[PDB]
Structure 1
Amino acid sequence: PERITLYTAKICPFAQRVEIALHEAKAHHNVEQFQIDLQNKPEWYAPKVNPASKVPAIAYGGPHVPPDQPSPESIKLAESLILVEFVADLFPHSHLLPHDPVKRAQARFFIDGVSTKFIPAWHAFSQGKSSEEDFLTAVEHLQALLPESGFAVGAYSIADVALTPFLGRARVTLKEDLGGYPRGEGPRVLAVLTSGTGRLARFGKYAQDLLARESFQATFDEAYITERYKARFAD
């Protein structure tokens, strides 16, 4: 494929979707990463790369230029889920997109549950807005989609890419008691989520498998995330 510049940020789960995808494609060393400081965004980023002023975004093709001077001739692409499909298209040997039309629809249906159920319910519960039961119920929705063994549709796919960054960050939030509930409640919910026993036994197994995946670990700066999450809570 043509050259890829990825504009990303270690803190951002949506960006990590694209980093995971590239890693599963064993292409993470082919691409040029540029880290965006979301508290001090470069003045060229929005007008030249992504008018929404968010990561992730990719510049595709065009001439070799420094990443802080992106070329007008490169194709600019945004939105994490699209970028993950684009990577799976560009690198078919990644096997991120299943061949079977049915399994693709199922993988994407799982992504829709991640978008419309898991992420909103995690946001609402981690921010003190909703109940623990509301979060567990949304997880149970994903659990009910899981097959007896393996990942969201058996073989690892884009469905697992879409979810893992948010699961990895939830774990930090919960493990570290940063969820706005008294000391120890976060960790108890983390156990429900990932123990592999109880109402969420099967999801727990799946979650263990997602967090163990090499592409997740390789694109996740746990020390950095933990530090930033503690500091934010402290405010």
Structure 2
Amino acid sequence: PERITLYTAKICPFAQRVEIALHEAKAHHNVEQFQIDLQNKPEWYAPKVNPASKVPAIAYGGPHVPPDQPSPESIKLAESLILVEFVADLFPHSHLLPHDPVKRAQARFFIDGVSTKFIPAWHAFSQGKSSEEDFLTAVEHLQALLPESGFAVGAYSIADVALTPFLGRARVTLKEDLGGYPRGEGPRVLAVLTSGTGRLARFGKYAQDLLARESFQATFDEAYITERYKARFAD
């Protein structure tokens, strides 16, 4: 494939989707990463890379240039789920996209549940807006799609890429009591989510497997995330 520059940020789970995808394709050492400071974005980022002014975004092809001077001739691409499929399409030996048309649809349907159920329910609960039960129910939607063993469609896929960055950050929030509830309530909900027992037993096992995946650990600065999350809660 042509040259890839990835504009990302350690804090952002949507960006980590693309870092995981690249690592699964064993291409993480072929791509140039540029870290965007989301509190002080470069003035050239929105006009020259991504008018939405968000990470992730990729610059594809074109000449060799410094990443803070992206070329007009590279193709600019945004939206994390689209970029994960692009990486899958460019590096087929990653095996991120299943060959079988039914398994592809089932992987993408799982992603739809991550998008429309897990993430909004996690955001609402972690922000103190909604109930614990609203979050757990959304998790049960995903659990019910899981096969008896393995990842979301058996073999690891784009489905697992989409979810994992949000799971790993939810763990930090809950482990550290940053979820807006009294001390100890965070850790109890974490245990429900990941113990492997109880109402979310099957999801718990799956969660253990997602967080053990090499690509996740390699793209996840737990110390940095935990520090940012404590500071944010402190306000």
Q: Does TM, scored on the shorter chain, surpass 0.5?
A: yes
Aligned partners of 2:74 and 2:15: how far apart in 1?
19
Aligned partners of 2:182 and 2:68: how far apart in 1?
44
Instruction: Determine the structure 2 residue equivalent to 1:45.
Output: 45
CA displacement 1:46-98 (0-9 Å, x = unmatched): 00000000000000000000000000000000000000000000000000000
1:175, CA displacement in angstroms?
0.1
Secondary structure, counterpart of 2:198 in structure 1: coil
1:107, CA displacement in angstroms?
0.1
Aligned partners of 1:183 and 1:226: how far apart in 2?
17
1:16, CA displacement in angstroms?
0.1
Aligned partners of 1:153 and 1:132: how far apart in 2?
27
Aligned partners of 1:214 and 1:133: how far apart in 2?
31
1:220, CA displacement in angstroms?
0.1
Aligned partners of 1:43 and 1:130: how far apart in 2?
37
Over aligned residues, Cα RMSD in angstroms?
0.1
CA displacement 1:180-214 (0-9 Å, x = unmatched): 00000000000000000000000000000000000
Instruction: Determine the structure 1 residue equivalent to 2:135.
Output: 135
Aligned partners of 2:118 and 2:232: how far apart in 1?
22
Aligned partners of 2:172 and 2:182: how far apart in 1?
16
So what's the TM-score if we normalise by structure 2? Answer: 1.00
Aligned partners of 2:30 and 2:83: how far apart in 1?
16
1:121, CA displacement in angstroms?
0.1
Instruction: Determine the structure 2 residue equivalent to 1:6.
Output: 6
Aligned partners of 1:224 and 1:183: how far apart in 2?
22
CA displacement 1:134-170 (0-9 Å, x = unmatched): 0000000000000000000000000000000000000
Aligned partners of 1:66 and 1:49: how far apart in 2?
13
Secondary structure, counterpart of 1:76 in structure 2: strand
Aligned partners of 2:47 and 2:130: how far apart in 1?
37
Aligned partners of 2:88 and 2:30: how far apart in 1?
15
1:30, CA displacement in angstroms?
0.2
1:224, CA displacement in angstroms?
0.1
Secondary structure, counterpart of 2:34 in structure 1: strand
Aligned partners of 2:162 and 2:140: how far apart in 1?
17
Q: Which runs of 5+ in 2 are unaligned?
A: none
So what's the TM-score if we normalise by structure 1? Answer: 1.00
Aligned partners of 1:191 and 1:81: how far apart in 2?
29
- The runs of 4+ residues in structure 1 deviating greater than 4 Å are none
Secondary structure, counterpart of 1:122 in structure 2: helix
1:218, CA displacement in angstroms?
0.1
How many residues were matched structurally? 235
Q: Which runs of 5+ in 1 are unaligned?
A: none
1:25, CA displacement in angstroms?
0.1
Instruction: Determine the structure 2 residue equivalent to 1:118.
Output: 118
